[PDB]
């Protein structure tokens, strides 16, 4: 089973790879300058290109196991080999995996098509498995079989849908037969040993296979849309409790890894800091409700202080054990 | 399976392509001029033609993989080749995909039918897949098979509906038979070996196929009307929570991509800015309820300030941690 | 399958075409004059004829793909060829599609039966599909098959209802038989090899076909009455929420297209403006409830202003963030 | 059954090993210096590398039975053999299990690839079973069989999915047969002894096996995602009760063992202390609710003291029996 062939044929496989990348950048990013000298209008334009380059980097990370983003500066094509000390970038460009040759972490340069680029100008997002000692994608051979079996079910249906029911006619003595059947609705024969039987196919095998395949897909991934066949929500809302969903934890871990990869060289070489927006976004009604409760807490605290005779140490001790104060 | 042939025959396929485009522009657009010199009456008329051109651009984006919108100015047909520096446009016209020849991003012009048009006058909405290194539509080969199987079910029904039940008559010794059956209701024969049997077809195979096909369609797309066979709502209402539906996220991403494509050249070359209206529209009753809650929040805040003795730093610190204040 | 033949035979097809047109004009129209010189009594009479002409225009739009409405003025039959600059119309008349010859958008005239009419006097409502590059109706070949199969089910029932049960009698040795059966209730024979069997038909095939056909019809259209077989409501009520139904969005889009077609030439050439009434009509009880809530909002706002010491900027800032104020 | 081969093929096995490690470090760590001389900016960077090294240490602990983390200092590659008295570290690096040779606890050095490293510079997380007197992974032979059987179910499905239904034709007298069946839908033969039967496979054995396998997997592990096939939550929320889940107890025990291993040498040789963040994270709404209840408790306590005439001993005795006071 080839992943590239499955990607071309199946839209289900395409969505599974791309769903995680779209959710990570759904709420946007935050870009800041340590020097505090870049204008916000210019800095916002840099954020727009960073988001576009990061979307393909995560997709390449999930499909191939590594992603490359080039931090373009005001330099010539031959200057890419030279390292960078401190420079504000001009933009970000995603580099195709197939055109990048990297010999490992022991080297500080790559070849792009043959332009030599120093690794200090590259944001690298890689999935290295220490047990396998190699870069691996987000899918395994078992996962590919499940997707292949999911698609093969409907290939088999198309193979027998036309002739799911047909007649088996035996007549030793034997257009006219169909003409009489269409008009009169009676099929007549004179052979005493003639037989006529309807041959029928069945779909119980394929129906049961789908139930087994769906269970396997859900156990092999954490993305809610893929497991539930687009029937469940992403579960990234606000429930007023700390019990977050599994998808939230998976997305939070991915965001942290991307932040570390981006900030490892943006801050050191380019003097820039990037941050992901909060996964949970509060609605306008929820913000008002939280403000009302917080104001009530302050009102109760003020009433307690005014109408009590607690010692200073007792009053002080209450402050540390209070979250808001 | 040909997409064009399926588009002609199936209205289900036509709706699936066009549903997303209709929902994006359902709430309208916002058009603004940076120079603040264009009259609102003229600017509103430009917005009307922009909406019409954008509807076909998204449809062409979903069906072919790229969309072209021509920004018409007060110029001659030969002046389209020349670039544009700054000019208020006259209108917008959608360009048919079949009549547009584009050699790639490395070129800055296209051929339309053979009129040469510079790319600075064109709004381009393209779906480029970096894994495939080509522009692709919103559907794959697997999706086309599901639609074809959905339509083929009812083709098979029409093929056997007339003769789903018929009589199989065997008589070696043998109008009159039907005449006696119509009146007396008795079928008589003298051959001791004669037989009469009803031959029946079955629909369990096609019923089970529909259940499997419906599940596959739901897993292959996110548009709620296509998955549920027009049984579910679009899920674009206001529930007072930040947990938005999957369709809302999909539409929001599409709107952002269209905004980037339109504003990439409207602002730079034409001095115009376009914005999409909010997907969620509040009802009149909901607006009043939000105002009542907000006024109550302000009343509580005023009461706390008047009837408390908090320090200025403590009062100031409360302001940042409050969303409304 | 011919659409015209299906229209004649099936009332289900007739309702499907006409239901959308009846719902669009159910709440009436609004007609206004820019010059503000036409009397309301005369202007109301124009609105009555406009509604009658618009009902057939939408029906022709759905059945054929284009609709024509003639704006009659105080002119002779030969003056229809001449263009119109500014003139108050006398009335509106729908033009039959079969008697109209139009060569395309590149021409500014049509032939009616052979009277030449300029296009400036005609309201044109057309459904042009850019993928097909032609005008298309609201139905496809797949939809016609579903309606044909729906009608064919009951044709087959009538073909076998009379002889759904009948007797198969075999007697080599053989009025009198029926006479003895009617009175004594016993059927007697002397042949040892005689047989008597009841032959029965079945309806499981047709029952299952109806379930499949109903699902297909619901997926192929958005009109609630057609999908549910007149079992569901139109869903155009007021629920106090912004989550409108699918039918409301479909009707709103149709109304906008009709408004653009009518106002494209009514305002420019005739100095008239037309508007559709709101799809959602509030009941008398609902209007009182909304007024009570709005008055309560004003009372709360007045109380807050009188009994607070907010700064002018803080008071001003609250106004923009309030919907009502 | 080889664990390494199962790890390569099955993503379900990979997640089971890695889920525990990801949950332990999900909330982050706390790093402190006893000397209180290291800057927080530098100390935070050390925590980042410690988290990365600890993630692989737990994975190696679960897969192999032991984990090694090297505490890198400002020394040469030959100085690793020498012991360390007191030194602030430069960073942390995980050591691959396959490249580490350890002769047991009786020795104070290991060989890494052949660099000799003293054990005082190494954080060792080992799972020693006293009944078996050896280091063991988190899985047994019985667990490996369950995973192998889970994967083998879908291998068998792929082996018979293509030919789940096929025709068995017997004809002594016998392209043309398929051509007539495709068009006319009738299969004709002249041999009186000819037979035609559909041969069907069954999936009841595999469906029942999955139910048995799922029960066994749940009984063999405590990780909620593995038992429920990613259907249940981790159960690490706040319910306001002391009845914690089984997964919380398992994670708490793992965190304590890691803390003991890290603090056994960080404090003694490097003067550093590490602590795990709380597994249960309170939401913003929950923190406000707890503060309101605590303030109410203080208000009630103040009211009781002011409006009572209890003896000093009675008042004092109430203090010890009160949790908050």
UniProtKB/TrEMBL annotation, chains A, B, C, D:
<dbReference type="InterPro" id="IPR024459">
    <property type="entry name" value="Acb1-like_N"/>
</dbReference>
<keyword id="KW-0614">Plasmid</keyword>
<feature type="domain" description="Anti-CBASS protein Acb1-like N-terminal">
    <location>
        <begin position="3"/>
        <end position="299"/>
    </location>
</feature>
<dbReference type="InterPro" id="IPR009427">
    <property type="entry name" value="UCP020357"/>
</dbReference>
<dbReference type="Pfam" id="PF06381">
    <property type="entry name" value="Phage_portal_3"/>
</dbReference>
<protein>
    <submittedName>
        <fullName>Phage portal protein</fullName>
    </submittedName>
</protein>
<keyword id="KW-0175">Coiled coil</keyword>
